[PDB]
Design a protein around this ligand. Structure first.
Ligand SMILES: Cc1ccc(-c2c([C@H](OC(C)(C)C)C(=O)O)c(C)nc3ccccc23)cc1C
Ligand SMILES: Cc1ccc(-c2c([C@H](OC(C)(C)C)C(=O)O)c(C)nc3ccccc23)cc1C
Lengths: 148, 148
């Protein structure tokens, strides 16, 4: 529920790496293709995310990816606290489901683009705008943040 | 005023290129350092922006940067219409002022980072969160979009 919580995880496709951040309360996704799973790339991604949305806490399914000096520095600078492990019945499998949908969409649009990174961003667009009298992830995140 | 309007412009520093998008109604910025001013880089940036915020119209101070096949394709796919020239007294010099503040902040934090791109993202964070009983650009954009 808390509006400041994001979960970050990397997945691999076509020998490339996709960093996926899910705003847990809304299902909204920010994703980028990165050359390798480095702390450098993770630190940079986090600084960008934090300058765009109010990020209070980051969760992950791989805690070791947040141990590098570069990543610690980014979270320190941006005022981000980390959770040890993952705390919540209301969000059970939400992050799993969102990554599943994103992967599924990427599959559906992949042949329209030359580059995986292009297909990923198309999939992000599609995901964030998809209506479930229901709302999209993009509409949900704005309402959650606006409500303060 | 209209909540779907963004202005995109490139600036150069340290022999590198900074793409800056300002949400005109709020002053909110998304910016990235790109290797060269290519249509490829602009197209990709636009697809990303469009998947994160509701982008209806793009303005620019350099219209030729939106003529390439790649950029036209991105705007077509994302449903983005372009303005010929720039239409508005309420927003007079808003984009100019925001680029000016961003440049000023980049200057203030530049020595804290090795890479320009890092300094740019720190500057974006600082800009978006800065309170002018006033609000920040980040608070303004969410309220504008939430109000529908
Ligand atoms: C929506 C959209 C927008 C542009 C393109 C597109 C790409 C994509 O790569 C980028 C330029 C976006 C980096 C691509 O991967 O095909 C590339 C390499 N070349 C193009 C050439 C002409 C027209 C469009 C594209 C393809 C799609 C599906
Ligand atoms: C807030 C923050 C976060 C991390 C860093 C940082 C960078 C920056 O580059 C990235 C890793 C972010 C790509 C840098 O440009 O200095 C680099 C190259 N190396 C580092 C090594 C150790 C600790 C921090 C950094 C510097 C700052 C100011």
């Amino acid at each position: 529920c808390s509006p400041g919580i994001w979960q970050l995880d990397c997945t691999h496709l076509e020998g490339k790496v996709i960093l996926v951040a899910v705003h847990v309360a809304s299902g909204y996704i920010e994703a980028e293709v990165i050359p390798a799973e480095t702390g450098q790339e993770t630190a940079y991604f986090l600084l960008k995310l934090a300058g765009r949305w109010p990020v209070k806490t980051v969760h992950t399914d791989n805690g070791s990816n947040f141990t590098s000096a570069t990543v610690k520095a980014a979270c320190w600078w941006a005022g981000i606290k980390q959770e040890f492990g993952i705390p919540n019945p209301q969000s059970q499998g939400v992050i799993e489901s969102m990554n599943k949908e994103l992967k599924k969409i990427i599959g559906q649009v992949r042949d329209q683009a030359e580059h995986l990174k292009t297909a990923v961003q198309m999939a992000v667009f599609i995901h964030n705008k998809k209506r479930k009298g229901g709302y999209s992830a993009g509409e949900r995140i704005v309402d959650i943040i606006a409500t303060d």
